[PDB]
Design a protein around this nucleic acid. Sequence first.
RNA 1: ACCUCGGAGCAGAACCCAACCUCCGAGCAGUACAUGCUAAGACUUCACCAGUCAAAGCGAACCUUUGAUCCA
RNA 2: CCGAGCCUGGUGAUAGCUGGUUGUCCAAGAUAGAAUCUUAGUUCAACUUUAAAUUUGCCCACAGAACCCAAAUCCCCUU
RNA 3: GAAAUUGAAAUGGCGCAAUAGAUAUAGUACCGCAAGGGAAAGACAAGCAUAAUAUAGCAAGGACUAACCCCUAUACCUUCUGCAAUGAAUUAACUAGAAAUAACUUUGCAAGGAGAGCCAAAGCUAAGACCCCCGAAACCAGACGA
Lengths: 97, 116, 101, 95, 41, 55, 115, 32, 80
Amino acid sequence: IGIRLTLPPPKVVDRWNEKRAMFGVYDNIGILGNFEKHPKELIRGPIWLRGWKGNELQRCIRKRKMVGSRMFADDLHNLNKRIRYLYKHFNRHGKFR
Amino acid sequence: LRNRVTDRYFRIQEVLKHARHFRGRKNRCYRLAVRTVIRAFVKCTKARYLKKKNMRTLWINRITAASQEHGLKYPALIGNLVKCQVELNRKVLADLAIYEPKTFKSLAALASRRRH
Amino acid sequence: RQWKVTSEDLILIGNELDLACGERIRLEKVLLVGADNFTLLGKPLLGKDLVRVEATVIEKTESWPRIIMRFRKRKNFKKKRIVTTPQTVLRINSIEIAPCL
Amino acid sequence: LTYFSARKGKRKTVKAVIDRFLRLHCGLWVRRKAGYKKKLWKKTPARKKRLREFVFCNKTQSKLLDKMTTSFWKRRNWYVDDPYQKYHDRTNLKV
Amino acid sequence: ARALDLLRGLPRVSLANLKPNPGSKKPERRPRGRRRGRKCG
Amino acid sequence: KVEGDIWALQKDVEDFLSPLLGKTPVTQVNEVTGTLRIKGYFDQELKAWLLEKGF
Amino acid sequence: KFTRSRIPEKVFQASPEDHEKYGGDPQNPHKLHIVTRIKSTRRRPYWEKDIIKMLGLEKAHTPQVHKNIPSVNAKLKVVKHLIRIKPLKLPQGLPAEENMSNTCLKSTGELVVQW
Amino acid sequence: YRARPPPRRRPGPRWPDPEDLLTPRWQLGPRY
Amino acid sequence: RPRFVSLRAKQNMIRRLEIEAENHYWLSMPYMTREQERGHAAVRRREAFEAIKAAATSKFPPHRFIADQLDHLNVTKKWS
RNA sequence: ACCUCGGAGCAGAACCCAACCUCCGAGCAGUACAUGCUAAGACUUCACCAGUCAAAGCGAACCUUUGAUCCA
RNA sequence: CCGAGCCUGGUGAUAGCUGGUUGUCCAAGAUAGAAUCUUAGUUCAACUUUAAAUUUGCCCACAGAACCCAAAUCCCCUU
RNA sequence: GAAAUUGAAAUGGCGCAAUAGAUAUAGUACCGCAAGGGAAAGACAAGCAUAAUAUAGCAAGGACUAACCCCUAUACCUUCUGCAAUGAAUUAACUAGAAAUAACUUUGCAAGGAGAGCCAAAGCUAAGACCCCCGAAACCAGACGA
Ligand SMILES: [Mg+2]
Ligand SMILES: [Mg+2]
Ligand SMILES: [Mg+2]
Ligand SMILES: [Mg+2]
Ligand SMILES: [Mg+2]
Ligand SMILES: [Mg+2]
Ligand SMILES: [Mg+2]
Ligand SMILES: [Mg+2]
Ligand SMILES: [Mg+2]
Ligand SMILES: [Mg+2]
Ligand SMILES: [Mg+2]
Ligand SMILES: [Mg+2]
C-alpha cells in the first residue's frame, strides 16, 4: 500500500528557459577577461561560503565568525551548541585516529 | 524526506509471491514470509542431493523386487551382470523390470548362469 | 546417462548439443536392443553393424529457473543464485537392427 | 590530537612531539635515548656511549609522529649551518 | 590526427555523452547489504 | 608530450632500452593523454636519446 | 607431545619375500612413481598438508607421476599413509612425439601408447 | 536569449561613506 | 557410552595397512642415489623461477586507447 | 604475603616457554679512576622503551643486582 | 515515584556497558606475545587485506649444535 | 593558541510536501499547584468476510495423477567458545558511517606547480575513496513549588 494508485501529474521541464540556456556563461571570466574577476566572484549565496568549502564544523565556525553578530539569538545559541557538538564528535569520535 | 523508497511494494511482492502457498500468516506477513521463503529455497537447493539419492534407492528396491521374482538377490544380479560386462545402470534395470519383464527375466537368467 | 528408448520417444538432454533443430543424428552407444521375443546385449556395447538408433534435434531450450540458496544461521550468511540449464529435446525416429549376428 | 581546531578548523600539532623529535625531510625521525642524562655514575662506558647517541625511529613510530605533526614540520628548511643538512636526504637506497 | 577523424565519424559530443576517465572515480562504499552492512566494518 | 604514433615511439623506446636492460622494458602507452610510461628510471638516457633524434 | 615421526630405515629395506609379493626388481628399479592421494589431509598435521600440496596431490584419486629419487621419496615417506604408490610401467617405452597425444594410463600402472 | 552584461570590477576608486555604520573600519583609514 | 570395533572396521583398517605396506616396498628402491640426483634438475628449476620472476616484474598498468575513450560517444547514436 | 630485577627448580636435546608457584639476594659491595674516546658488524627477555657484545682506530696505562618523562 | 523535590537550560552530558546498525554478487580472510589503576578496554607485535618492487622462499640428506651426569628440535646442498 | 604583516567583492533553491517541513490547523486542546510540558488532524497492507475443521508434528521441500498421506528437514536475530539466554503479535511509515594526516588512482603542468600566502632533490595542483544510532544513574545554574 505504500504506492500511489494514480500517475503523478506530468512534470514538464523547459530545457531552454533563460537560466538553463545561459548556465555556465562567465565561468571563464578570469581566463578570458584578463583575470580582472575570479570565477568564484560569480557565486551567489551565503556571505560566509562564497568561494569557500568546508565540512560542517568548518562551515559552522565560519558562519559564527562572519555573521554571528547578525544572527538571531536562538539561532546563534543553536550554532554555538552545534559547534561544540561537532568539535567533540570530530576530535573524539570515529573509527580512525 | 529528500530520498524515499517508492519500490517497497514490488520488493515485498517478490517474496510474497513465493510465499503465497504457505499456511497461516507466513503467506501474508513479510516478516514471517521472508524467513519461510528462505528456508523453502534452502530446502529446494539441498533436495537436489536427496532426489538423486532417493531415485537410486527406488531403483534398487524395484530391481530387488523384480530379481526376487526370479530367485536372484540384488547383489547377485548386479555383480554377475558386471562380470558379464553388461553395463546397464540401475535406472535402466528398474525400467526394464517394470516395462520389459521378459528382458529382465533374460538378464536374471544370465546373472544366475554367470554365478553358476 | 543410459536412456530406455523406442521409436517416436522424446528425450531431454540437460545440455546443448551444437546441432540445429530438426537435424538427424545417430546414437552410436547402444547397450541393449530388445523386441517382444528376443533381446541383444552388448558387452558392453552392441556393434554398429547390428543396431542403428537415429534421433532428431526437435528443441533447444533453457530449463526453468533453478534456485540455489545458501543460508547459515546467525552468521549473516545468505546467498541466492538463479541458474537456467541449456537443454535439448531429441526425438528417437527409428531403431533398426540388421542380421549380423 | 585535535583534528579540527575550534577557532580555525585546522589540524593541530602535538607539541610534545616537537619538543622531543627531529624530523629529517625524507621521513626519518631522530630522537635521543631515554635516560641519557640520568645517573650516569652507575652506568658502564659502553652503556653511556649507547645512550649519548641520536637514534632513528620505527616505521610505525615515524607514522605516528607524522600524524601527530602538521605539514609545517615536514617542509624543506634551508638553515644556515644545519648539522643535519646531509642527513635530510637518503642516498643509494633500494626500495 | 586519426582521433579527430574518429570524432567526425562519431555522434555529437553533448552533455549526455560525457564520462569520467576510467579509474578517476572510485565507487562509493556505504554500509548497506550483507557485505558492508551489519557491523559496518 | 607525444604527438603522432605513440606506438612507433614505444617500439623505438623498447629497441633503444632493451640492450641496456637485457630485456624488453615494460611500458604503458596512454594514447589518450599521449604519454609513454616505462618501468624503471631512464630519464637521462631517454633525454639524451630524444636530443639525438632532434626533438 | 605430537611431533614428526622418524621412520626407521629398516622399514624401507625390502626383503626377497616382498620382491616376490609385489613384483619389483631391486636391480633396475622403476624410474617413476604414480602417486594418488587416497586419504584426506584434514585432521593431519600441517606438514603433511604442505607435503601433499608440494607433491600436487590435492585432488584425491588423481594420479600424479613423480621421480623415484631420494628427495621425492623422503616427501612420499612423510605422507605415505595418505597415498597409494605404484610404479609406472612402460611396456612400449616412453611415448614418442608422434604418439604423445595417444597415450593412456591403464589401471595396472602401465602407460600405453595406443588408445 | 542574450547574455547579461559580463561582470566587471567597479571602475575607479571606491569610497565608502564614513557616516554609514556598516562600512568596515579598514575601509576608512589612511591605509585604504 | 562405549564403542566397539566391528569386523568391517577391522577389514577397512587392514586394507589401508596393506596399501601402506605396498607403499613401503615401492619406496624402498630409489632409482638414483642422493649424490647422483644432486643438481640434475637445477637448470629446469632455474628456468621456472626465471619465468616466475618475469611474471612478477612485468606487472604494469594496461594501455589506454583513444578508440576506447571515443566509443562512449555511441551512447547517443540514433537513426536519422 | 606478593607486585621490579637477577640466580636456581622448570622444562631431558636451538630458543621460547609449567603463568600461578618453590628457594635464594639486589636495590648493591669491592676494585680501578683510560674501570677512556670513537667506531664496522651483531645480539636481545617474543612490540616499543630499554638492555647487551664488539673488530678496526685514537689515547692512556702495561672489573667481578635495578626506575622512563616532566620537573627541580 | 525524596539517602535528598520539580522544571528548564548547559545537553545530542558521559557511558571501556547493553541493544541496534537497512540493496545484490564474488573473492581473500583465524587464537597468538608485551605493557597497561590492566585483564568487559586499549596500544604495540603477530596474523589479516589491498597495491607495489624485487629475488629467492618453504620442504630438507649429510655435516654441525655441553659439560655438569625420550619423542624430538634447530640449521640447509639437493629436490 | 596569537600578533606584527596581508586585504574579499557583492531574490534564489540538484530544500520538505501532512509521521516530512516550523511544535504549530496551535503554544490551542490536553497534562501540571506552578515554573513548565505539549498534540492530533485535511484531501487491492495487516485484520476479517466470501469460505471452520481431518491422524503426523519450524509447517516447507523433493515430489506426485492426486491437497494430505511417503521421504528429508533442531525457527530468525543478537550475545556467549558452541547449544542456552536476549528481542520480536502483525502491517504501514519513519529509523542509524558525518572527516582529516597520509597514501593509491585518474587528469593538468612539470624543475617547477598553484588564480599571492604554500610546497618542491619529480614535484605540485585538482578530483575520486574512508571514520554510525538509541539508552543511564548523575553534576551544575536559574526558576517553580508548604
Ligand atoms: Mg562477509
Ligand atoms: Mg627463572
Ligand atoms: Mg628484542
Ligand atoms: Mg514528588
Ligand atoms: Mg551516547
Ligand atoms: Mg572464500
Ligand atoms: Mg600506572
Ligand atoms: Mg574495560
Ligand atoms: Mg507536522
Ligand atoms: Mg488483505
Ligand atoms: Mg518478548
Ligand atoms: Mg498549609
